[PDB]
Write an enzyme that holds these catalytic residues in place. Structure first.
Site, PDB file in Angstrom:
ATOM      1  N   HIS A 145       0.807  -1.214   0.000  1.00  0.00           N
ATOM      2  CA  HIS A 145       0.000   0.000   0.000  1.00  0.00           C
ATOM      3  C   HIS A 145       0.844   1.269   0.000  1.00  0.00           C
ATOM      4  O   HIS A 145       0.293   2.364   0.159  1.00  0.00           O
ATOM      5  CB  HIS A 145      -0.975  -0.003   1.184  1.00  0.00           C
ATOM      6  CG  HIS A 145      -0.320   0.140   2.523  1.00  0.00           C
ATOM      7  ND1 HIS A 145      -0.286  -0.885   3.443  1.00  0.00           N
ATOM      8  CD2 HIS A 145       0.295   1.194   3.112  1.00  0.00           C
ATOM      9  CE1 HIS A 145       0.338  -0.476   4.534  1.00  0.00           C
ATOM     10  NE2 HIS A 145       0.701   0.782   4.358  1.00  0.00           N
ATOM     11  N   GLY A 183       2.934   5.950   9.548  1.00  0.00           N
ATOM     12  CA  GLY A 183       4.309   5.779   9.131  1.00  0.00           C
ATOM     13  C   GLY A 183       4.983   4.533   9.667  1.00  0.00           C
ATOM     14  O   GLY A 183       6.040   4.149   9.150  1.00  0.00           O
ATOM     15  N   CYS A 228       3.940   1.575   9.288  1.00  0.00           N
ATOM     16  CA  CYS A 228       3.742   0.473   8.355  1.00  0.00           C
ATOM     17  C   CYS A 228       5.068   0.085   7.714  1.00  0.00           C
ATOM     18  O   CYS A 228       5.837   0.944   7.274  1.00  0.00           O
ATOM     19  CB  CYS A 228       2.722   0.860   7.285  1.00  0.00           C
ATOM     20  SG  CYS A 228       1.076   1.240   7.939  1.00  0.00           S
TER      21      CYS A 228
END
EC number: 3.4.19.12
Lengths: 306, 306
Positions: free
Chosen positions: A41, A143, A145
């Site tokens: 993503h 952030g 991720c």
């Protein structure tokens, strides 16, 4: 003596944390050998996350749209691929700080250390467990991720988790290092229901063994119980069923403390029916379930790593 | 979202952990530049620890009696000195993995990350706090002596603790990196009394602010109280007195949440007098005091390090 929620040394993992930027989205990536792993993503905008066609959005992107930064060094991307929910970016430089590593898919109830990162920079480290409903109760802001969970055997770093999504309920979900989500969750901003979460019964018992080792013995009765009678108490209080495999892995703890496994189950049964009466066990007023039997043995014997 | 007991990334500290052997005693040492720091009781046998004359026992030793091992590399010792309770071994090789660092003596109530080691090999990392009685509730087995506590500003590692002694009560005590013990404790196997331990009141309040940020708001009343009325409740329940300096450092948390400091003190006062009634705050049935106001701000904003 003393018992603490202990995380593995994060040095071997810090040297693999890079920053991946695609368009406006920036997250963390795992640089192992000449491949950078990051959540897919990163190719999505905020509007895309409502319902993204990842195959289509990836087609619009080329190798030069991915900016990988290892501190201040840029890494030229010479190839990209999508394996399930992770992005595999092949770079021209093999990571010199690459440790010995494997990719492992853990089971519910197992524990691992999480290295929370932001913009490719390590921020902190903490120990957590894979809940029976395949969620984790972590600390992840925007952030984070791409942050990874891991275990360290001695010299080998067994990467087992990558953070992808924060559910609307505040709990977190992610994949293994092959992109396969733990549980029924997907990398999409939608209403995702996590199932009923139960307590890892075998972990609670090992934590009770750690307490007896460290002096806390007030919960010890000489009541005993059968495996079926205890599981009858376990089902009422939303505990995972105890199997003979669980009894076998608690064997060494039973041998060191001299307390039979079924005798400890009767102590836990009394704890579930009567509570803790305001007392504490290892500085906790609740029953801890984030210590596997392996975690207790390590901390109560001093197992070191590289 | 989510709140976890988070420790600093330990990579910068792992590269400084060496093994120090003097005679039969082996413990951990801190290799910074061309100096290795370790507890001075490495020169003691088991009988010596009852009442050791460290000046005399050090005189019997020479430079070659100290064996420093950085993994598999031996470090030639070219000089030794005793500063208070730590041993300073000058080696011929400057540590190439030396990070930017300072030596800081923390105050009671401050927190730091502990890198538990054995035989110079890192084992785990966890966050703990300096209790008001200058003890720490850690996880230290035999051989962990020499393990260090630290904080990381961004690139600078502020070393603040070295473990020396486990008290007969199971709690632990140690020195700063200049050999000065925290508290009245000494490096000798004797009956050492730690004073009455109180709860770090300013830390509990910051943890309550972290709960409001993360959704847990059931403890919020609109009762208020004065600074003197709350300290009257604090003294009854063995809490540290709250000062105006404590109110000032909780300022930003009060500004982000919009909850006045004295309004949160009235919520804590109700928590102390009425308990938690079986509910939980951030997954805990007790009042946590190991999160400083700085720790809450870091985790609730994503402060990263090198």
């Amino acid at each position: 003596s003393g018992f603490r929620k202990m995380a593995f040394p994060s040095g071997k993992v810090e040297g693999c944390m890079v920053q991946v930027t695609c368009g406006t989205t920036t997250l963390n990536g795992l640089w192992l050998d000449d491949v950078v792993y990051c959540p897919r993503h990163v190719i999505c905008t905020s509007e895309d996350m409502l319902n993204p066609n990842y195959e289509d959005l990836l087609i619009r992107k080329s190798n030069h749209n991915f900016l990988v930064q290892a501190g201040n060094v840029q890494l030229r991307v010479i190839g990209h691929s999508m394996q399930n929910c992770v992005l595999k970016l092949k770079v021209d430089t093999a990571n010199p700080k690459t440790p010995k590593y494997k990719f492992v898919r853990i089971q519910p109830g197992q524990t691992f250390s999480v290295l929370a990162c932001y913009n490719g920079s390590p921020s902190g480290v903490y120990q957590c467990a894979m809940r029976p409903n395949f969620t984790i109760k972590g600390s992840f802001l925007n952030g984070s991720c791409g942050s990874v969970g891991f275990n360290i055997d001695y010299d080998c770093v067994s990467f087992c988790y990558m953070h992808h999504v924060e559910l609307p309920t505040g709990v977190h979900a992610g994949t293994d290092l092959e992109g396969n989500f733990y549980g029924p969750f997907v990398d999409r901003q939608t209403a995702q229901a996590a199932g009923t979460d139960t307590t890892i019964t075998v972990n609670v018992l090992a934590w009770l063994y750690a307490a007896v080792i460290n002096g806390d013995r007030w919960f010890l009765n000489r009541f005993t119980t059968t495996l079926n009678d205890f599981n009858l108490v376990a089902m009422k209080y939303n505990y995972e069923p105890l199997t003979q495999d669980h009894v076998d892995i608690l064997g060494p703890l039973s041998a060191q403390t001299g307390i039979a496994v079924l005798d400890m189950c009767a102590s836990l049964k009394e704890l579930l029916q009567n509570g803790m009466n305001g007392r504490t066990i290892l500085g906790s007023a609740l029953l801890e379930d984030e210590f596997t039997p392996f975690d207790v043995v390590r901390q109560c014997s001093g197992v070191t790593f590289q």
